[model samples]
Each structure stands twice: as structure tokens, then as C-alpha cells.
Target chain A: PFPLTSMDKAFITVLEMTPVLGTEIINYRDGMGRVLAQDVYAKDNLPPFPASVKDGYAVRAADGPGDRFIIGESQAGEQPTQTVMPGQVMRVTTGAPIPCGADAVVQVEDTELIRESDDGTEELEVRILVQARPGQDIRPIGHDIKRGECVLAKGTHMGPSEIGLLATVGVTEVEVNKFPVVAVMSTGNELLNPEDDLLPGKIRDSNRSTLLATIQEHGYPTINLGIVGDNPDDLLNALNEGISRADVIITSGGVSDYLKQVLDIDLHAQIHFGRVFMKPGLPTTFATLDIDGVRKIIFALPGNPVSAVVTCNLFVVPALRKMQGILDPRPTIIKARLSCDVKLDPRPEYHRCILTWHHQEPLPWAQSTGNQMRLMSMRSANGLLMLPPKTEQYVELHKGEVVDVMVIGRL
Target chain B: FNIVGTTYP
Candidate 1:
């Protein structure tokens, strides 16, 4: 494979994106993708008081083993009304409140009960089998959560667990920081949607769909403009609409010289057309503009589907995270070893590969699907391997050559 | 959070 130029080889620019306010605040049920505006504090203590974690009997530690004691029963959701006396044990079920006089619980399997009858009354004998330490099997109050404690911090994107916590804390609604709406567009002369019949010289459009899902998955709602043909005027119109309706704009397909010269649409956000210092997405472009005092950011990636996806993962997602108030946005990358022999490009190149754990090591390949075309390179890959661009002999990485892996899992 | 099958570069 040939080495590709560094991301810095291209020129690019950025537009300021101002924060916006979001309106709805339904319960935690509706907060999954919403930003958090305030730190959530526990309003009340959890578990209220000491509780039982299992079904068994609550007893005093001093009730020496082999001593016969009276039997008292306690069920869940209800506690024994009276205080337990010394040398006496009370039956307790899971999640049940502990009796006032008990400090420890002994599982039922460790004890035996003997029934005896006296002249006018019946007495029960309790045989203690195993010794218990203090507070065994007894869950004191506030084990899961506490009152007046910080449950969640500001700018949190609520997941199922976070939502559950909020609900458990009795939060009906939440205030959150809002990001500008984003619009994703795909452009170029040879671009067509996948469902449309492919012409002899045209390829299917995949950027819009890939970016749409990628942006939306990262918690940013997106507006899709479909596929714009090779007309500059048509591209301008679509850009105008996106500028009017969204806070950020993203388009792929005209960053390359060939696409720019052939496509008839004027690319919006064409401010600084440069690339970042990275592999696999070296041909990426960026544009920005100011609308009515609001900063709008635009990113135009190289037309190839793989390039678009890679740049989106490296750059777009981080931008979205920033919009959502993420202070230190970074993509999650893992260190994996090459499973088979592989070579690196003389220049930095983003190599696409399928990821798997073999012998507890990560393996990446440079073969499959035909030519390592930018668009089809990752057809069978789960992520892109960060192959450093360097000059060397056909570099052959062994079974355990350390490499960085770009995660492509759902956000 | 999830495990996907293996792939080549």
C-alpha cells in the first residue's frame, strides 16, 4: 500500500459554535440524550433504616451457640413491632426491616429449631449452629445512596443507570446545557443514495447515513439534507438551509480536488480548508461562518466513505461532545497486538481492519475486498488501525506488534 | 461495552 500525506498537508478552518438553551424537561424517562445543567443531589436517605439482605433469622450475637431461644418471625415490608429480648431471635425475610433489638442476622441453614411443650404453654428451642460477626447479612441504611449527596454532576448525558438513579431520587425533570442543532449533508457529482440505481461512473452515497447515525448516537440531534448533486448552486442552497436551521453543518464529497472541480455546488463553510494531523482522514476539510452573531461550525470530509467515517470519529464526535459541554472530549482507543504479519505505509495511513481477540491478542489485516480503496477498505472491518506513516522496508508486524485501535462500536 | 468479531486491515 502507498503512504498517504499527513493531515496537515491540507488547509482547513473552524467556526465558533455558541451554546443554546434547550426547552423540554420531562422526567428521567426523557433525559437520555439531554444535557444536564445542574448537579443532582440526593433529596432523601436511601434504605431509610437498617434492613435485611436475605431470608433468615435476626439474632443477638451474645446468644451463645447451642442455646435454645424463642422464635419470632419478621416479613418483608413490615417489621416486628416490639424490641427483641436478649437470647431471643426473630425470623426475618429478605429486604425486611430488622427488629429494633437485633444487630446481626444468621442464615436459616446455620440454625435448627426444636419445639417443646410445657404444662400450659408451648416453648420453642433455637439451636445456633454457626457464629456470626457484627452486622453480618444486615444492610445498614444508606448503603446504596445517601441523603443530600451528589448523585450526578452537571453536563452528564443520562444513560439507563443514570436515569434510574434520577428516578429513584424522585427527580421529575432536569435542566441541561444545550448544543446547537447540527445538519449533515452529502455532496458530489458521482454521488447517489444506496437505494438509487448506480450509474456506470457513479457510486452510492453513504456519508449522510453514516454521519447521521454517528452524530445522533453521540447525543446530538441531526438534520439530514440527503445527497446534493454536482451543482455548486444546489450545494449553496442546501448550505443556506442548513445554516438557517442548524448550529453546525457537515458535508462530505467535495474536499478532494477532483470533486471540487467537477461538482457544481459552492461548498459552504469553506473558510479554512485544511486537515488535522492524523492518518486515514488526511484529506478532511473544514469550514465555518457567523450567522446573526451565532458561530456556526462546518466540517467537509474527503468524499470517500471510509475517510468521512474516520474523520467523523476523530473530529466530529469530539466537537459534538464539546457542544454538549464535555470538558475533555477524547475518543476511546485501545492498544491491540497485530494477530498476523502486516506492513505499514511509508507515510501515515489509517488502515481499516476487523477487530478480534485471538489468544488474548488483537489482530489486524491489510487484505480483503480487493484494492484497499478508501471507501471499501473497511467493508469488513470493525475499526481503523492507526498505522503510523513512516519510511521503512515492507514493514512486517509480528503476532504481537502493539498498535492503536479506533473503536467503531455504537456510542 | 460490547464485543464484535475480528477483522483485517
Candidate 2:
């Protein structure tokens, strides 16, 4: 094994080597959380015609402030052939196209009801109580969007508003950067399937389930690779299959220098880093292989459930996000005050913590999830408090001390 | 494998 690599250098190395994923055409309705591969241009002018901005009477602007006879009704999505001449108005609904010859609209609130049928089924006449301007209460052609205009630029991250814009511009399908497919697996001789009954010297595999959920939560596609044994040959076979099918392979196991050696000699894989100086993920390994001009990334994380999840957030997620073309793929870090005193570890620690906000406090309060050795410490933890290693100069961080906390949720 | 060597919490 090589000398332990610092977390920052290891992270940068992983980032610099990660390849951007390819692009695919998908329905715009399914484009949420995707990145645009091409700039989206409006096919037709928004409100292609002069549309009404309010539910009221459409009239000629020259005929200012007067009662006018209602010629006909113009509802949304229907065109009225009759023109709105001088001293004549047409009843219009919101989003309805402005009647031909009508230059302005008088909203219902600015007009008075004059007379209608005895049954009250029609608006026969309306009194214009306010003056009107030519373009008042009207959305002119291409007002919101113009044809041939780039409404969304390439590399734009699609969200609710972006999808709405796509629909507004009649873009039913779009070209978008693809999200990498992930294959998650566990490796251990003593590991048991969660469905199986407990056996002597065996523990149920929780790392796979936890990791799969984490990846799925971010809306990426995932495959359950199940569990592989500690035997090097068996592990190699599982990995080779994963590389053939998935873009990124994440495994929790005993595959440190042992499997890296085989992958290098047999599969032409390059191990970028074999060890990190962090506490939970000291034996963490990142490797890459280029087979027939295609790249496959492998993240051999620590087998412990907590360590597996923590390192995934710290390492794998950023790579996945960058592959998806996110502008900044790093986790969000914010200052937080410690709620209780915490002793430092021998190596830099990514301590699981729960963060709470108080109305009066300047920063969120960070409470330790529990002792680091407890696997359950990861439960309900929303942040990782970056704790520096112990030394003569600084051995403990007291309560109320503000520290940088990486937000694990909603990234 | 030693769990302590692989993970902290």
C-alpha cells in the first residue's frame, strides 16, 4: 500500500479524473434534475397572438370611457372572427387572444355591468369606468418568449421552473446530459443477506441497502449488485460484470491492496489512491479503467455501514454530480456551533452530527450523533462536522465553538 | 477484517 493520502488531495484527484457522461434525448416532462445538453430555443412566439391578460372587455383604445355593446365572447383557445370596432367590445377571459381591431382590454374590476339577459346568462353591455391604452392588459406576441430565442442555455440544471418553461415553449423532448448508472455491492465472507436468518459469526449486510438508498435519493439510476465474497477471484468477477453494465461501481469490502493488485494486473485498472488519512475510511480506494475507449470508475469504500455512507457523500456524490454537469458538485459547508464538548481523534474525523437552528443563534447548533464507534451514529445525522486531529496545541473543541459542517441532506 | 481498522462509527 502507498502512503496515506490527505482527503483534499484524494478528492481533487478523483475529481480531475472523473469523465463527463454522455448525452441522451428524453421527454421534457421527465427532465427534472437533469442538465441540458443543448440550448433550448422557443419554437414559436409565446402567446403566439395578442392575448388578453385579464378576464374583461376588449375594446378599441380610441373609444375611451364609455358604455359599449358586447359583440360576442372570446374564450381561451378560440378565435373570434368578429372585429372589436369603435364603441363595440367583446367579453374575454384571461389568456384569451385579444379580438382583432381591439387594441386594449378593460379588466372586470375597472368596468361596471350595465345590462344582460333576464336569465343572466350573458354580458350584453359593459360600462368602461377607466381609460384604456393601446397595449394595456394585453400580452403582445412574443411578450414572454420569442421564437428562435434561447430560453434555456446548455448545461442548465432543470428544475420545476425550467420544466415549466420547456412546456411553455412546446419543447416536448430535450437533449440532456446523462446521469451515471451506479452499481452497489457488498463484499464479506461473514455477511448474510438481510432476508436470511442470523447464523453464527454472521451479520446482515446493511451497507448495500444504505448506499443504494443514498444514490436513489439523489435521483440517479442504480443497480443492486448484491453481495460478493471476500475471495479475490469471486470479487474480480463481480467487478468485471459491474464495469460492463454500470458507469460507476461502488463496493464496500475487504478489497484493499489485495483486489487493487488483481484489478491492475488482470483488468488494466489504475488505482489513483489506495488509502486516505481519514478515520473511518483509511483503506478507501479509488480506481479507474479504460476498456475499449470507455471509462469505468470504481469506489472501494470501507465495509462498515457508517463509513460506507459517509465516504460516499464525501467522495462519490461530487463525482456523480459533476458527471451530470452540475455547475458546482461539492457538498455545501456552513458554519455551525458545537452543542456539546467533543474530543478529537488521532486522524481528521468526519463526525456525524445532527444540526438544529435557533431563531436567535447566528449559526446552526451541531450535536454529535453519538460515539464514533457506534454504527447507529449515522442515523438521523444531517451533517458531518470536520474535526481536526488531536495535538498538544488543540485537543478538544468546547461547546459553542463554531466549526465548518458539511450538510449531507438536500445536496 | 478488523471493523475498528475499517471504520470509526
Candidate 3:
């Protein structure tokens, strides 16, 4: 029943858990949010050939500002066989390859067609009114990307921008890390289903639904293990089933140091730590078990609604991100100035805060979300201020004091 | 039966 610091537990969780080793190839269209397992390089240059960026005349830069004969026309999809010579220009549309012997493109707005055939079949002559540089309006080969350049590195999370970059590099399919299946369950004697009628000592089970939804929202597959009573056999059976099915098991309630009779003693699992030095979640426990030679991680979190949510965001989300091969898996922590005074707790507190930006200040200001005991305090909370324990010298935070705030939602 | 790989202080 050893106690561990929050930072120690965080480090232990990630160091003990192993990421999934297998990978699968999926098409770019279905690769969003997947972690790339290998680097992707460009197979061909973007804009494979010298292409026109404007609807203009392709001509030699040295033969500028003079009337020229129109030899051929090049559209977007066609290749022009007529080469530009002295006093000759080719009409090239945007994205069309420039004809050979042409070093620049004169925009149509800067030139005028002095004469045309009677039937208007041919552009007889064109006057270039502006001086054209050798490479003006003509995109050189590989202007956007080179053939052998690395477009995407391994462990990159595929988003819309990453997918677009993959398409630009001609990558149709990519190998990505596999995600784990999570088993979500709750334990308590007084918990009942949402449909059940309320009894004197019974409360509806909300932790299961909230946990399942949170896990699913992050793109992980989850299995609902339902509620298990406080009986030892019931807890043992539920945990064994979870171990066999899921890579990560999350359970709420029945954790503290004295719960060994229901868990470590009966189930024969290794409890890594039974307590953490954090308020509202001090009774949290983390354990591991081996089932059929496969190791499974179990997170036994506090039953309180806000406590469960806070611990999930601080711990479970980071583990999930790490399992998916994200380089940095922790929640984004930033510094902010306290808008109001706050009393310090004996233990390190993750005080819920609503971050706001003032018109004159550069850094965001953080204010408490109200009574920490009430779950409503979490409503509209975008940040959690990691306030250190009050020492003998310092008791509470004063106004405008800087503190580390972990961003939980959009500000 | 302990096969614990690593432990942190």
C-alpha cells in the first residue's frame, strides 16, 4: 500500500504499458487520426513538368515586347508538339505544360492581339506590353515538392492536412499503428441502471456511460462490462472477463488500499500503486495482470463524477495517445495568471478553471469554476490549474499569480 | 509469480 506522487504514477503508467506492435495498411481516405508507422516520400515531383500558372502566351524571354505569331495552343490536359521559336508564341492555359524553347509566360492581360485572320481562326500576332522575366508565371518542375523529399515522418497523426500532403506525394495507402480495445466497467453495490427506479440507497450508474462515451470520442473501441456489485466473486469475474477481452481496462470505485481483498488477493493481479497524492482522486489505483501471456493494464479510478472525469483526462487519455504512437501524449500544459485568489489544499489540486483572454493582456486569465465538490463546477471548464500544496511559508495564491494550467477543452 | 518489468520511485 505504497503512496506515489502524481508525476511518479504518470511516468510509471506509460513506462509499464507497451504499445501495440502490429500495423495495418489503410487508404488515405480512411487514415484520418491514425498514426503513421513508416515515413512516406514523394515518388514524383509535384507539378511534374514546367507548367503555366496563368492563362498567357509562352514565349522566349529574349523575344519580349514584340508581335509574335501564334503557333499552337496548349490546354490543361494536352501536350503541345509545336515548339516556340523566335517571334513565335504558344497560347498556354493554366496548369498546362509550357512548350519547348519557351522560358517565360506573358499574361494575356499584358498583351494584345494586333491582328487575326478574317474568320478569327488564328491569332496572327500578339503584342507583349510588359517585360517578362525568364521564369515569370511559369512554375518550374518540382516547385512545390521534390521527388525524393520526405513528405511525412513516422508517428505522424493523420489529419486532413496530413492526408492532403500524402495525396500530394502520391501515397495511396499507409501503414499505421493499431489502437487498443478498451473495457469500461463500474463497481459498487448501490449503483443501478439508468432505467431502474430510484431506491433509498441506490444511485443511477453514470460513470460507465460517461467513460464509454469519452473513450469512443477519442476513436477507441470500447466494451461495456456493466455494473458489478461489491461482492468479491462478482468483481473477480468481471475483471477476468475484461482482462480476456480488452487491452486496457478502466473501472470506477472500490479501489483504496484496503480493497486488496476484492482485487489483489482474490484476482491475483499486481497492484502497482494503491494511492496517489492528488486531491479528489487520492484513492486511485493502477494494476496489471497477465492473461494468456498477454499483459493488460487496469486503471481503477475514483467514483465521484468530477473526479472520474478529471482523472480520465489526466491519465487515460494520455495512455490512449501513447498507445497510438503519439510522440508527446500528455495534456497540453500552459502557464496562466490567476484572476482571483484561491485557497491552497494540503494535496496537489487540479482545480477546474475557466480561462479567459482579456483585451489588453497577452496571457489568458484563469478563474475557479466554483465549488469543487459539485459536478457542475466542470461545466464550461476549459483548463485545470495545477496548484501545488500549501507549504508552511506560503498558504494561498494571490491575485495575478502565475500557475501551470492544463488545457482540457477549447478556450 | 511476478514478471514486473520496471518500477519507478
> What would the DockQ be for model 1?
0.05
Candidate lDDT values, in order: 0.66, 0.84, 0.79
Of the true interface contacts, the fraction found in model 3 is 0.00
Q: Candidate 1, residues A105-137: lDDT per residue as tens digits?
A: 888788876766666664477678888777999
- Cα lDDT of model 2 by residue, A1-411, tens digit: 489898778888988999998899999889999999998888898778898888888889999999799999887777778987888999888878887999998889998888977895987888998989878989999898888999999989889999998888888989988889999888888999999999999989989999999899899999988998777688778988899889999989775455776678888899888889887788799999998898999999897777887799889998999999897887777878888887878888776788888898777988877465454543478887787777777777788877778888752
Fnat of each candidate: 0.00, 0.00, 0.00
DockQ of each: 0.05, 0.04, 0.03
Off-target runs (Cα >4 Å) in candidate 3 are: A4-6, A9-21, A62-64, A109-112, A116-123, A129-133, A256-259, A370-379, B1-9
- Off-target runs (Cα >4 Å) in candidate 1 are A1-26, A33-35, A53-55, A60-71, A86-88, A116-123, A128-137, A155-158, A198-204, A216-219, A255-270, A275-283, A339-346, A361-380, A392-400, B1-9
Query: What are the runs in model 2 whose C-alpha is more than 4 Å off?
Result: A108-129, A255-257, A360-362, A370-379, A390-393, B1-9
Task: Put down candidate 3 lDDT per residue, A1-411, tens digits, no spaces.
Answer: 475656555555655564554688888998878999999999998788899989989999998788898888887777777888999999888878998999999889999988878995877788989989989998999998998898888888888999888877878989998788899988888899998999999899999998888888788899999998777678778878987888898999866333456567876778777777776677677777776777788888898877888788777887888877777776777768877787787777775788888898877888877455454644488887777776787677788877778887766
Per prediction, the TM-score for chain B is 0.35, 0.24, 0.38
Chain A vs. native, model 3, TM-score: 0.90
Q: How many Å off is the CA of A149 in candidate 2?
A: 1.0
Interface RMSD of each: 11.0, 11.0, 13.2
Predicted complex 2: CAPRI docking category:
incorrect
Best by TM-score: 2
Q: Predictions ranked by TM-score, top down?
A: 2, 3, 1
